[PDB]
């Protein structure tokens, strides 16, 4: 046996030049794709913004064209999904996770257009979903598209070009190269056996796409939270506690995301019409909320900075938390195209802040700043619901640049994952592949 | 398909027993690491204040600098040849082996040997880093508690071993993430999936990092300040720098190995000619650590100085050569202690010089050499160890200049890319492969 190792060891880190070059193209495409998608959502959120101007006097009439603008845009997207690409509804990440096990198809000729224009409308109407959904799936697809179109062959190149698309796709959505890389190797990568996913390949794609995102979205953070205070050792136990809280709520939130998913299915029955109408309903409800209480609706990024600066009351926080648990589920469990990742960043931020707010009053002797707990909590729901702690932590790091909070973050996030396990819940992106797969089976 | 649905639903489950044990492993490796750190200081200090007792007689002080290092070096080379041959050199390849179940983890032996062993090579001011000692000591500490708690399984053997190695790197650089990524990019049996639980490793890394902090709080090993940003029209420069690291990467591996051979003959294998050749290089270091500290030592001290563009282009090219020389001599020779840190220093220095030139060729880019120093710091690590992800995050964690993330990723990747196409190998892996071919032949 030993003699094969010595032949393997000496062959370690070799990635066929063909593959590498292709990842580069994959990356560049996904980047541009992602940037295009980003401009899209803006433009629409804008038209919407300036349509409430045309009707700025009649309060009842404006509440209307807010609802109908979101409703119409939402429907356009739910439809686009049910008609031409069922698999492109919801997140799409579990779908890409499947493709790595070779257990789901990558219908790129279908999904690319469907997901792109599909989300372009659910996000545009101001529903509570993130870009990661669309970009990661669009990412992998863009991945396979160039696999096919260059008739590249192999087990390596199929899983490797697919992964790097997914990474460059997450990278491009958060301006987070490392988060994109760690994402593959912690949530994606067929987690029960080793695969031929070349890390170096992924890297390249993530780079190329990050550079694309930068050619266009330079000079302004998604989240600018400033540089917060440090965290003294005698303060650490507090983050463990916060974690334990995220770790029990983690599962319960997964329960709901799935439950609510079921309970929503009945509404339409499966019927493309009752669906597209129920979509346009939630859709519209969002555009209504995005006007008369923006913190309850929308991606959630806007309220992150505000909440980390302790600029919300404890009331406004508990409100925003509930309103958002509600609009998040409604928007995602319902099957609209778009991620649940970002709205989870917002959820955890808000929760964490409230924790800090209390921590601050119970311990003046710790000289706390609630903001540090908001930052500890930002990737914490992601920790307990997705079981991607390493990924969340580095995502938040890349996005908020408060490295001093690394211990507090790791502790909240780990402590989150620990309790998500011992209270018995599952990787939400994985329990969703498992539903999907049990249904594709228990109908044959 | 039906097994997947049963596997997927079982994903992320790590036996509570293991987790609790990682915690202990971590705490131990932490304390271990901190103790080791105080040790090296204390000795570097005695040495410092021995050149005081003899502060007048220049020829006599050059002497007790050489002899103090020489004596301390020998004590350690010996301690290795006599009781634990495997604890010489880095020890990481040794731990890498144990993950394939292809090398023994003689903890009852190596712990004391590596600890006191390095305590002397580092103390005497040789050019080697704490990672060597801590990572190996780490895994050992790992197995020690596996055995002593008769824990069983394939999971718990590779898990508890990895988390020790991680907590061990973590503790050496105050780098939790770098420690975690380190396992899953350089360690983890890279040809098949293993039962190394990430969540397990994490916990140990944490516990050990908190130990390192209970004692080494307030004071960053490398305080480089917050450097300037890097404009897109500036990125191609870091690609070029990487291509340079990527061709030098292999050549440095050639030497580390070659020089390793060429040094073997010196002592033949003979524990006496070895311990004497050790004490020789040892002493040469303490001599250099006085009359030119930048050529000797761990190298951390000169990082800040070089990133602030406080060396001349001359002093840089000198320090680079003198250091390639002392680094090889110190590591290829078999002394206990890592090559990681001296690679950080090597890359920093190289990068700076690159920046210095970049600055004069392009006043229109408003460059700061410092950014290229930071791009280069993990770059040799990229091309020689093929751990780019790990280097990047190590430098990130140590220098807190996240704005340089693109420049860094680009230099590092571009480094790894050329290390491949110019045909070189993961140095920590070519070393397991030598070791293994000799235990076979």
């Amino acid at each position: 046996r030993r003699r094969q190792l010595i032949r393997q060891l000496l062959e370690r880190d070799k990635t066929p030049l063909a593959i590498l070059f292709m990842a580069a193209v994959v990356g560049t495409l996904v980047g541009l794709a992602a940037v295009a998608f980003d401009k899209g959502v803006a433009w629409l959120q804008n038209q919407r913004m300036g349509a409430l101007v045309h009707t700025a006097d009649n309060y009842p009439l404006l509440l209307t064209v807010a609802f109908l603008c979101s409703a119409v845009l939402a429907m356009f997207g739910y439809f686009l999904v049910r008609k031409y690409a069922p698999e492109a509804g919801g997140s799409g990440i579990p779908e890409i996770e499947g493709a790595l096990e070779d257990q789901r198809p990558v219908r790129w000729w279908r999904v690319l257009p469907v997901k792109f224009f599909g989300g372009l409308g659910t996000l545009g109407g101001g529903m509570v979903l993130g870009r990661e959904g669309p970009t990661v799936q669009i990412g992998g697809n863009i991945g396979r598209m160039v696999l096919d179109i260059f008739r590249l062959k192999g087990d390596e190149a199929r899983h490797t070009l697919l992964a790097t698309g997914a990474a460059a796709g997450l990278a491009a959505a958060f301006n987070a190269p490392l988060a994109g890389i760690l994402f593959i190797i912690e949530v994606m990568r067929p987690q029960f056996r080793y695969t031929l996913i070349s890390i170096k390949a992924v890297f390249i794609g993530v780079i190329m796409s990050t550079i694309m995102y930068r050619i266009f979205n330079h000079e302004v953070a998604l989240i600018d939270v400033g540089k917060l205070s440090d965290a003294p050792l005698n303060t650490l136990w507090l983050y463990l506690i916060l974690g334990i809280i995220f770790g029990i709520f983690g599962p319960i939130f997964n329960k709901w995301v799935l439950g609510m998913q079921d309970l929503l299915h009945r509404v339409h029955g499966g019927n493309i019409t009752k669906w597209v109408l129920m979509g346009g309903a939630i859709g519209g409800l969002c555009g209504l909320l995005g006007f008369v209480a923006p913190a309850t609706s929308g991606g959630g990024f806007n309220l992150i900075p505000i909440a980390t600066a302790g600029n919300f009351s404890m009331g406004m926080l508990v409100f925003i938390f509930v309103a958002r648990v509600i609009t998040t589920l409604l928007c995602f469990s319902s099957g609209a195209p778009g991620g649940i990742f970002a709205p989870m960043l917002a959820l955890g931020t808000v929760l964490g802040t409230a924790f800090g707010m209390v921590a601050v009053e119970l311990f003046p002797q710790y000289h706390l700043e609630a903001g540090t707990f908001a930052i500890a909590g930002m990737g914490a729901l992601l920790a307990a619901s997705i079981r991607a702690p390493l990924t969340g932590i580095i995502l938040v790091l890349e996005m908020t640049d408060n490295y001093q909070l690394i211990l507090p973050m790791i502790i909240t996030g780990l402590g989150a994952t620990l309790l998500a396990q011992f209270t018995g819940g599952k990787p939400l992106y994985s329990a969703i592949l498992a539903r999907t797969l049990a249904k594709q089976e228990a109908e044959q | 398909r039906r097994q997947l649905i049963r596997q997927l639903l079982e994903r992320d489950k790590t036996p509570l027993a293991i987790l609790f044990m990682a915690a202990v492993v971590g705490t131990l490796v932490g304390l271990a690491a901190v103790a080791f750190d105080k040790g090296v200081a204390w000795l570097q200090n005695q040495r410092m204040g021995a050149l005081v007792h003899t502060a007048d007689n220049y020829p006599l002080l050059l002497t007790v600098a050489f002899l103090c290092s020489a004596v301390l070096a020998m004590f350690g080379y010996f301690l290795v040849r006599k009781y634990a041959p495997e604890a010489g050199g880095s020890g990481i390849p040794e731990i890498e082996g144990a993950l394939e179940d292809q090398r023994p983890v003689r903890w009852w032996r190596v712990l004391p040997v590596k600890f006191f062993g390095g305590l002397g090579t580092l103390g005497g001011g040789m050019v080697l880093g704490r990672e060597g000692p801590t990572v190996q000591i780490g895994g050992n500490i790992g197995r020690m508690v596996l055995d002593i708690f008769r824990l069983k399984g394939d999971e718990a053997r590779h898990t508890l071993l990895a988390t020790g190695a991680a907590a061990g790197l973590a503790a050496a650089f105050n780098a939790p993430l770098a420690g975690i990524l380190f396992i899953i990019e350089v360690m983890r049996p890279q040809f098949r999936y293993t039962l190394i639980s990430i969540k397990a490793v994490f916990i140990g890394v944490i516990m050990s990092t908190i130990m390192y902090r209970i004692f080494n709080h307030e004071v960053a090993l490398i305080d480089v300040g917050k450097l300037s940003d890097a404009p897109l029209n500036t990125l191609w420069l870091y690609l070029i720098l990487g291509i340079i690291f990527g061709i030098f990467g292999p050549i440095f591996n050639k030497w580390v190995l070659g020089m390793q051979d060429l040094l073997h003959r010196v002592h033949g294998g003979n524990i006496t000619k070895w311990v004497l050749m050790g004490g020789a290089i040892g002493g040469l270091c303490g001599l250099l650590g006085f009359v030119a500290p930048a050529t000797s030592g761990g190298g951390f001290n000169l990082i800040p100085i070089a990133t602030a563009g406080n060396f001349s282009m001359g002093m840089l090219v000198f320090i680079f050569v003198a250091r390639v020389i002392t680094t090889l001599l110190c590591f290829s020779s078999g002394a206990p202690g890592g090559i990681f840190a001296p690679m950080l220093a090597l890359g920093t220095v190289l990068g700076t010089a690159f920046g210095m030139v970049a600055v004069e060729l392009f006043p229109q880019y408003h460059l700061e050499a410092g950014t290229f120093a930071i791009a280069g710091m993990g770059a040799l690590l990229a091309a020689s160890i093929r751990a780019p992800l790990t280097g990047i995050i190590l430098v990130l964690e140590m220098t807190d200049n996240y704005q340089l993330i693109l420049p860094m990723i680009i230099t590092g990747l571009g480094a790894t890319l050329l290390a491949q196409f110019t045909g070189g190998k993961p140095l920590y892996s070519a070393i397991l492969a030598r070791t293994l071919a000799k235990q076979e032949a």
Epitope: - | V359, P363, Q364, H366
Partner: antibody, heavy 120, light 107 residues
């Protein structure tokens, strides 16, 4: 964010003066600072720039110690010293914060000016 | 040092016109900038990297060019656009400014 330059006025030919630029409303380290001047009725001319750690200081092609650009981040203030002032030095002196987009640098934000008049 | 020469030294136009000034450079430049300078006032960064508008600059403004020829147009000029437009390169060192198109209004 404000740049408020000062110390312009009457100087005798062959003399010398120290214009100062007071910076406020932004982290005055972090930024390269610069001086540009407008001769009366005429166009813009770059005098020089200084990086935040005063370790780079470029000038326009001109004579050895003609201009001396310096900064003092302690005081959030840029300085310009002009020597052996001749009449061509009579102008409006602008203080500018430097920045970039793709990376070809530009004069981001400008002060109001002080005027230097060289006259017997 | 690159010499930038701006086409019309002075020019006139009725609001509503499409107005267009020119920056020509002696050697090659890339991503040049523009500062409008309204009267008795300090220059304001207007267009940059050849065609990005600074925040605030009304959208009637646009930039373009490459090589040795750049322009700073203004689809449907307005009366308040009356300024002297200076162009500037820093793709080569040292930076250099153009001479100046003076925009003169016709009521």
């Amino acid at each position: 964010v404000r740049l408020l330059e000062s110390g312009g006025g009457l100087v005798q030919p062959g003399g010398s003066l120290k214009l100062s630029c007071a910076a406020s409303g932004f982290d005055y380290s972090r930024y390269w600072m610069s001086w540009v001047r407008q001769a009366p009725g005429k166009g813009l001319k770059w005098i020089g720039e200084i990086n935040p750690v005063s370790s780079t200081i470029n000038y326009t092609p001109s004579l050895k110690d003609k201009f001396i650009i310096s900064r003092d981040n302690a005081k959030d203030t840029l300085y310009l010293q002009i020597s052996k002032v001749r009449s061509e030095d009579t102008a409006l002196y602008y203080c500018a914060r430097l920045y970039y987009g793709y990376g070809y640098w530009y004069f981001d934000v400008w002060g109001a000016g002080t005027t230097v008049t060289v006259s017997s | 040092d690159i010499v930038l020469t701006q086409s019309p030294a002075i020019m006139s136009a009725a609001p509503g016109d499409k107005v267009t000034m020119t920056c020509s450079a002696s050697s090659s430049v890339s991503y040049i900038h523009w500062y409008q300078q309204k009267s008795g006032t300090s220059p304001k960064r207007w267009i940059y990297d050849t065609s990005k508008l600074t925040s605030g600059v009304p959208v009637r403004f646009s930039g373009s060019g490459s090589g040795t020829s750049y322009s700073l147009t203004i689809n449907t000029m307005e009366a308040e656009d009356a300024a002297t437009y200076y162009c500037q390169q820093w793709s080569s060192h040292p930076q250099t400014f153009g001479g100046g198109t003076k925009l003169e209004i016709l009521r």
